[PDB]
Design a protein around this ligand. Structure first.
Ligand SMILES: O=C(O)c1nc([C@@H]2CCCN2C(=O)COc2ccccc2)[nH]c(=O)c1O
Ligand SMILES: [Mn+2]
Ligand SMILES: [Mn+2]
Length: 176
């Protein structure tokens, strides 16, 4: 999984995932499935953009969580949007709402429901992606155009297929 993660993901993404796990008392080399899951979730957050023109999305994920909260505060003060109780993944400057991104090896609908229960607030948008080319979003609002989401689904499916050829997929699917 390590050898796969180092080869499959960008070195900056690998460095961020190593920090997040060591920060939470877990080592990248034993809980290898968490290593790959954190790398994949980070990548999806980076691709969550229409890829053109303005900086529509503030990426909250992948940053020092203490510092990321000050950014959420600054947005809420300027925008007036209610403050989320849990640190979201992105903020949409066009729709003026926070986004929680989910990447699951389980089903998109059951993973959305768990997120919605935990989020509690109806204001934070939820967008779930799977490794099987499916997605689920709040009120069927997928935020991005279909080509941007197609890039994410194909990348996730590509990750899924690359793991499967190395016999790593089934264990990665069961770790969740
Ligand atoms: O998408 C998601 O599932 C998602 N989940 C979380 C959960 C909530 C509790 C803390 N936590 C984390 O994973 C915090 O990092 C960790 C935790 C354990 C090991 C390594 C890193 N946080 C999100 O920001 C997020 O996007
Ligand atoms: Mn997050
Ligand atoms: Mn997330």
């Amino acid at each position: 999984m390590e050898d796969f993660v180092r080869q499959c993901f960008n070195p900056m993404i690998v460095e961020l995932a190593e920090k997040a796990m060591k920060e939470y008392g877990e080592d990248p080399k034993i809980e290898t499935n968490k290593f790959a899951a954190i790398c994949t979730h980070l990548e999806v957050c980076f691709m969550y953009s229409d890829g053109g023109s303005k900086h529509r999305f503030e990426i909250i994920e992948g940053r020092d969580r203490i510092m990321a909260w000050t950014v959420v505060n600054s947005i809420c003060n300027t925008t007036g949007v209610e403050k989320p109780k849990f640190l979201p993944d992105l903020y949409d400057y066009k729709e003026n709402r926070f986004i929680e991104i989910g990447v699951t090896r389980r089903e998109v609908h059951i993973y959305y429901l768990e997120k919605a229960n935990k989020i509690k607030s109806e204001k934070t948008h939820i967008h779930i992606f799977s490794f099987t080319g499916e997605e689920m979003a709040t009120k069927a609002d997928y935020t991005l155009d279909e080509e941007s989401r197609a890039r994410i689904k194909t990348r996730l499916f590509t990750i899924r297929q690359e793991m499967a050829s190395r016999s790593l997929w089934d264990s990665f699917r069961q770790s969740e």
